[model samples]
Target: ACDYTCGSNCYSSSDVSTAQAAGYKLHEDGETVGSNSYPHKYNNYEGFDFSVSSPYYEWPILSSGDVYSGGSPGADRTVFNENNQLAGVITHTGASGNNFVECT
Candidate 1:
């Protein structure tokens, strides 16, 4: 699982369909692809939490193509907790990308 601290944290996956399955829904009616962000849930702090799912084959294509090239801005699942402080975030990927899952 990947973790981020301070500043703005972001996570992404090449597999569009997997991303959708892991709660990362598409935005702009699926026009831009992987341009949507979801909110994360935290119990202690005020931050955002979210998950992503993607496949291996799709990852290379998506990552290589212009759509996700140039380091695409990953969706922000920011959530404001009761305290109003950044808490943590969670991102999921497929086996191709080691299908790693990160929570920070």
Candidate 2:
């Protein structure tokens, strides 16, 4: 703001990567404040979106030595595609429409 004012701009919210590519760190707080309520929302407000962390029954990490007697479930796995490691999940039921949000 050194004696110069920049004009407004519109960036693509095509997806998360677009924001990342432009070096913008995205975030979310439980405060939906004005647009939507917690545990419910459909569209991205301000062309931005969010997600919430959730945990479920863990998947098993790989090992076939001898049994289910001594092992850890998939809670800490990067064995797969280096993705979805958090094991966040979603199950669908009948609804008019839906969207997924991620809140860190």
Candidate 3:
């Protein structure tokens, strides 16, 4: 599992939007301060793999647009074992400043 923080200007809820736009289905629903799961199924003990395919952007760039100064922009990839446990994380930094960090 991974949690991404989109700066104060951007709500974490946007993460769900972005993920959905990218074809990721939500496994749970709630506010930004709750736990959720993804639609993908994996063994619950071997660890799971995850990755970021693109950078997170700030909305209305003209008004509040800025590279995520708190972190860099990048894609994170992870691999999970058969037990659904975390296997590893692969990070691919994007153009810098525009992407968020991937935490496992």
Please report the candidate that would top TM-score against the real structure.
1
- Per-candidate Cα lDDT values, in order, are 0.29, 0.21, 0.28
Per-residue lDDT for 4-89 in model 1, tens only? 42123333333333333333222313323333222222232222232222111121112222334224434323222323332233
Candidate 3, residue 41: how far the Cα is off, in Å: 14
- Ranking 2 against 3 by TM-score, winner: 3
- Please identify model 3 stretches exceeding 4 Å from their true place: 1-74, 94-104
State TM-scores per candidate: 0.22, 0.16, 0.21
- Per residue, candidate 3 scores C-alpha lDDT tens digits across 1-104 of 22432222222334433433322212222212112122233232322234422221111111133321223222432323333333333233332553333332
In candidate 1, stretches whose alpha carbon ends up further than 4 angstroms from where it belongs are: 1-76, 94-100
Task: Tell how far residue 8 is off in model 1, in angstroms.
Answer: 15
Model 2 per-residue lDDT tens digits across residues 1-104: 11111122111223222322221111122222112221222223323221433221222211231112233321111111112222222211121244222222
Number of the candidate with higher TM-score, 1 or 3: 1
- Model 3 RMSD vs true structure: 13.1
Question: Residue 41 deviation, candidate 1, in Å?
Answer: 5.1
Q: Give stretches of model 2 more than 4 Å off.
A: 1-15, 19-34, 37-104
Q: Which ten residues in a row have the lowest lDDT in candidate 3?
A: 54-63
